[PDB]
């Protein structure tokens, strides 16, 4: 504990003291351009769709978004959408490289303009680490 710093009881941290719930609420929508060409939420195909992310989509379900029970980490994609061309290309929404946790829930609801629109809540228990600011 040096120059305005402190030392914490490791057991109390493990007992649960000063533990945190940390949520993230990602959002996306499709149908932006109109004229019946339209982005589609789906598990993509790697063939002829060359805009794929570093993370693979084995975690993706059939309609392109994962259930509220799947532990996630790294760059594992959460929402896979495809934008058409005049074949399809990726517009998937990966996860932030640093964070990791559990998908808390997934919400779909249309917009006022009639656009398909999704909000994914991810959750993590963040424990008091060493260099956290208190």
């Amino acid at each position: 504990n040096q120059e305005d710093s402190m030392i914490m009881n490791q057991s109390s941290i493990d007992r649960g003291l000063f533990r945190s719930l940390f949520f993230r609420s990602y959002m996306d929508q499709e149908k932006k351009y109109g004229m019946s060409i339209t982005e589609t939420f789906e598990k993509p195909q790697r063939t002829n769709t060359l805009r794929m992310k570093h993370g693979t989509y084995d975690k993706l379900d059939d309609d392109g978004l994962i259930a509220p029970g799947v532990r996630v980490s790294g760059e594992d994609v959460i929402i896979g959408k495809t934008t058409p061309i005049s074949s399809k290309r990726d517009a998937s929404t990966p996860l932030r490289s640093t964070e990791n946790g559990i998908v808390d829930q997934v919400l779909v609801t249309t917009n006022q303009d009639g656009l398909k629109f999704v909000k994914v809540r991810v959750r993590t228990t963040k424990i008091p680490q060493i260099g956290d600011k208190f």
């Binding site: 009881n9 057991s11 109390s12 007992r15 649960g16 003291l17």
Partner: protein, 65 residues
């Protein structure tokens, strides 16, 4: 949120006491400190684990979903 199960430092099991706590003031008309004395909560590190906390989960329960 929820009642802490054990005091964060001196380790005593404190989860079971909470409910009795609420009744201990109600029917017998006692102060908080004496009701904490009844449950063997001598050490104030333990003794601070209950009183400091308010059971907020009740407010969560009212919501239907």
């Amino acid at each position: 949120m929820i009642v802490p199960v054990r005091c964060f430092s001196c380790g005593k099991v404190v989860g079971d006491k909470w409910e009795s706590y609420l009744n201990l003031l109600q029917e017998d008309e006692l102060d908080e400190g004496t009701a904490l004395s009844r449950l063997g909560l001598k050490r104030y590190c333990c003794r601070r684990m209950i009183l400091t906390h308010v059971d907020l989960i009740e407010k969560f329960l009212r919501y239907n979903p």
